Every structure is written in C-alpha cells, then in structure tokens.
C-alpha cells in the first residue's frame, strides 16, 4: 500500500500492510558514522550497545516488545518491534527511554560493562571476519581525510579514549528534532499518525545539527593487510559510485546486476551468467563474486569483492574482470540487458518487500530522511523499463572509463600487481 507522511519537526511515516501482523515502531536519525570526527569513532555503536544492554530486560519483563538497532553510515535507527495491539506501550517505552529518564541508563558500571563488551566484539571482528574487514578497509582507504572513511564501529584506541563527556556531547548534538523521523511499518494504519503528534511525545534539543565543511571526495589508494598465515586471499575493488537522489541510481544498480554474483561450490550458480563466468570456469580462479553498488547521501561506491584460493593467478582473476568491465563499457547485447532487468526486478522486490517489518522500517526511514516520500515498487519498475543499451553505454563511459580505483586485500597477496598493471588495463588495448 501507499505510504503517508506529514512533518511538524518530527516526521510520521507509515507503510500499512494487512499482510503482516507484527506492528513495529521506531526512530531513525539522519546522523550515523559519517558525521563524527576521527577523535573517537566508537560513539554511535556504543550508544547502540547501550540501548541493547539493560533496557532489553525492562521491555521483556514489563510487556511484550523486542527492540533492535543498526548503524551503517547514516541510517542510525532504533526500531522497537511489537504486537499489533501493543504500539501504545511500545511508544510509552520509547518515550520513557529517549527523553526522560535519560540518566539511569548511563550508569557508570553499566558503561564500563558495555565498553568491555564492545571492545571484545570489535577485537573479534578484526581477528576473524575478513570479508567485511576488507570492505571496511576499502571504505577507509577510499575517503582519506574525510568523515566518510572512518569505520562504523571505531578503533580500539577510539573506544578506550573517551568515557562520558563526548558521548553526551554526541547525544546533545545529534539526537534532535531536525533529523528525527518515526516509523510505523507493520499492521497499523493511522494511530501512529496521531500518537507521535502529542503533548507527551516530543524530542529534545529543538535546534540544529552541526554542519561539516569538507563533505566528501574520492582518491585511489591501496591497503595491504598481508597476513600470509591466513589460508585464502580476500581482495576488493571499487570505483566512484553514485549517491542517493540521482537520476542514475537504477542504471548503476543494473550495471552491477549485469555481471551478478557467483558461487563455485553451488552447481546452480555455476550454470548461468555471462562470458566471464565461463572464462574463469575454464581454469579455476576464484570461489565467490559480489558485485555491489553502495550508495550513501554524500557519495557512492560501485565495485567488486571476491575470495580465492588459487593464490598464483590473482593477476588473471583481476585481468578477466577488468576486460569484462571494458566489454560492458564498449558493447552490450540486449539479451543480457533483459535478463539483468528481470534479475534486478526479482532482487529488488525481494529486498523491499521482505516478510520482516524491521528491514522495511529501516528502508522506509532511510528513504524518508533524504527523500521526503518513499518510492513504490510500481514506479521503480516503470523507471527501470526505460533503461536501454545506449543509456548503459553512456553511463559506463563516464564512470568506468579511466577512473580512480581502490583495492583492499589481505591474506596471501604476493602475486597482486601493485597499482599500475591493475589500472593500465582499461584504456590501453586496441580500442
């Protein structure tokens, strides 16, 4: 169904859905990990863990309502799921937790307990999770000296530096009325439209969020977390992408979808696709493909992530993918364009209409904060049927033709060509 929005400082947006029967309500803030100086990165995740530390007992014992949160770059949200008849008590808990009282939550001993838990979690992430660590390092090395490269969970020193002063400063400078939007995804229709606009339901700090000076940039770079003890090799690539609210977002998404994903050990994924899959199937080269188009408010990131075990032929693995990108930017067949259209329609329908209201609420908040109104499935399909081979060619001429790239790798990367033999394979052939 269509969404309804209104705004008096606070914005109330609801996506009614009789199909589901788990009403949810939350608050999405427009400031995440992209609006914080590198002095102490780990503040947003610290707040998230604080919200996920002791109020869980309160919500479980008092009534029936489960709460969750997620912060990636600027979609800092605190969603509180519930039953259809318990939205009143859900908003009651939210009100009692985010305006008053706001002092007993920040107890000292609770703060050190949360700090220790977050330190353990970030250490575990650094030690174990390689596929996400390489992407985080790609983010760090793609936006050097800019509040868009610092990691979303911070560094060890950043967590251990500050205690309570900068946390409360962040709360006072980023938990405001200007960039706060409530969400009513679930099985509710109009009570959310009124309960948020109420005398008891107000947000503190009716001021303005501080504005940064240097917005964003992009410069090619390398990072080599070479840990040869690790068995496999994880590498990633990236090219300057496209931010949200641009009339090319779907074109970049389709360009990413054209090549698609691939898993070597899944027989179904081995028996489809495009020419590069056959080229890498002839001689075994890699195991995973993940063509991504990451989009944020300030800038974007369109690239490629993979993991391989045949450490000897990293150069061949990179060379084939770059040659296929060049083939895309020179000549595209219409059958692959049609199959990419169908696959993108399927994947976007799956993502935007999943059965879990939490993801739908997160997407609705991300759209409402920077758009003002959510774009429905039908309009997305209408705008994607107009994608043509000439449009894709023209778009790829500007973005994928002699543009800066950034590579992040770890594991056994001895055979990885440093920067010139990996960049000179774009416009140096018999064009």
């Amino acid at each position: 169904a269509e969404v309804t929005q209104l705004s008096n400082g606070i914005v109330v947006a609801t996506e009614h859905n009789p199909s589901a029967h788990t009403a949810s309500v939350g608050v999405v803030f427009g400031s995440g990990a992209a609006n914080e100086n590198p002095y102490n990165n780990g503040v947003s995740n610290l707040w998230k863990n604080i919200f996920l530390s002791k109020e869980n007992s309160a919500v479980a014992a008092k009534e029936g309502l489960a709460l969750s949160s997620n912060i990636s770059r600027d979609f800092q949200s605190y969603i509180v799921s519930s039953l259809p008849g318990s939205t009143d008590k859900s908003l009651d808990f939210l009100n009692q937790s985010f305006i008053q009282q706001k002092a007993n939550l920040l107890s000292s001993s609770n703060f050190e307990a949360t700090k220790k838990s977050v330190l353990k979690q970030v250490q575990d992430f650094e030690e174990n999770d390689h596929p996400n660590r390489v992407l985080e390092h790609l983010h760090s090395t793609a936006f050097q000296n800019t509040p868009l490269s610092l990691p979303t969970r911070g560094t060890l020193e950043s967590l251990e530096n500050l205690v309570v002063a900068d946390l409360e400063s962040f709360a006072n400078n980023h938990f405001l009325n200007s960039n706060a939007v409530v969400v009513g995804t679930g099985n509710i229709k109009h009570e959310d439209l009124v309960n948020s606009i109420e005398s008891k339901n107000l947000s503190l700090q009716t001021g303005t969020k501080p504005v940064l000076k240097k917005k964003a940039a992009f410069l090619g770079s390398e990072v080599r977390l070479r840990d040869d003890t690790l068995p496999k090799a994880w590498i990633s690539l990236a090219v300057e992408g496209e931010p949200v609210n641009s009339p090319n977002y779907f074109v970049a998404k389709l360009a990413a979808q054209i090549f698609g994903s691939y898993n070597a050990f899944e027989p179904a994924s081995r028996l489809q696709g495009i020419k590069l899959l056959d080229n890498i199937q002839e001689y075994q080269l890699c195991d995973n493909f993940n063509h991504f188009s990451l989009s944020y408010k300030d800038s974007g990131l369109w690239g490629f992530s993979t993991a391989t075990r045949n450490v000897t032929m990293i150069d061949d693995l990179i060379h084939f993918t770059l040659k296929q990108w060049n083939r895309l930017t020179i000549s595209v067949t219409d059958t692959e364009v049609e199959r990419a259209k169908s696959l993108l329609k399927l994947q976007l329908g799956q993502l935007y209409e999943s059965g879990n209201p939490v993801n739908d609420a997160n997407l609705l908040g991300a759209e409402v904060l920077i758009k003002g109104s959510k774009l429905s499935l039908g309009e997305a399909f209408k705008k994607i049927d107009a994608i043509t081979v000439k449009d894709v060619k023209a778009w790829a001429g500007k973005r994928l033709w002699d543009q800066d790239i950034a590579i992040a790798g770890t594991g056994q990367i001895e055979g990885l060509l440093d920067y010139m033999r990996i960049r000179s394979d774009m416009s140096m052939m018999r064009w």
Partner: protein, 55 residues
C-alpha cells in the same frame, strides 16, 4: 590462465621480459647492464650493415 601466458612464445616473452620480480632498490648501475646489451645488439647490427658493402 590468460592467453599471454598460454602461447609458448608469448609465455616465454612474458616470463623473461614482461614479468620479472626484480628487486625494489635498483639504481642506474643495474640498468647499465641492459644498456650494454643494447649497445652490443646495435653494434652487431651496424657491423652487419657495414660488411654488406665491404670487400
């Protein structure tokens, strides 16, 4: 594996000319050897062209 490393002549050219893990502290002294090799080659070529019109 790329065709550049597949063809035997191209594979030899790549492994002996195009690709060679040379050290990263090379000064001009090491390039002096390749310069001398080129001088030897040009000397042979010019001598051959000299002897063609020689008695």
């Amino acid at each position: 594996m790329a065709f550049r490393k597949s063809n035997v002549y191209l594979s030899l050219v790549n492994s002996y000319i195009i690709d060679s893990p040379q050290p990263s502290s090379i000064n001009y002294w090491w390039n002096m050897g390749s310069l001398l090799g080129l001088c030897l080659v040009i000397q042979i070529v010019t001598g051959i062209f000299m002897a063609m019109h020689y008695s």
